[PDB]
């Protein structure tokens, strides 16, 4: 079976999406995006 | 789009780093080792 989850992540290190990126700062981190995450497990 | 290796109990997340491989005779319930397909945005 698959799980499909928000993620944010940088192509490397990886977490829930928690809303990382609705901050009211200026800046933002240069890597990290939110993305979709299609899991299977091995 | 990326192909990652995630130590996952379907809820949270973390790059996979050989967390399954400890000397302990337990391991937890709830997380396993799983392939996750990243596409952005």
Redesign the interface.
Known sequence: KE?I?T?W?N??????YTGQDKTISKYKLKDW??????????
């Open positions: 799980i989850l993620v992540t192509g490397n290190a990886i977490r829930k995006y939110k993305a979709t995450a299609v899991i299977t497990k091995e």
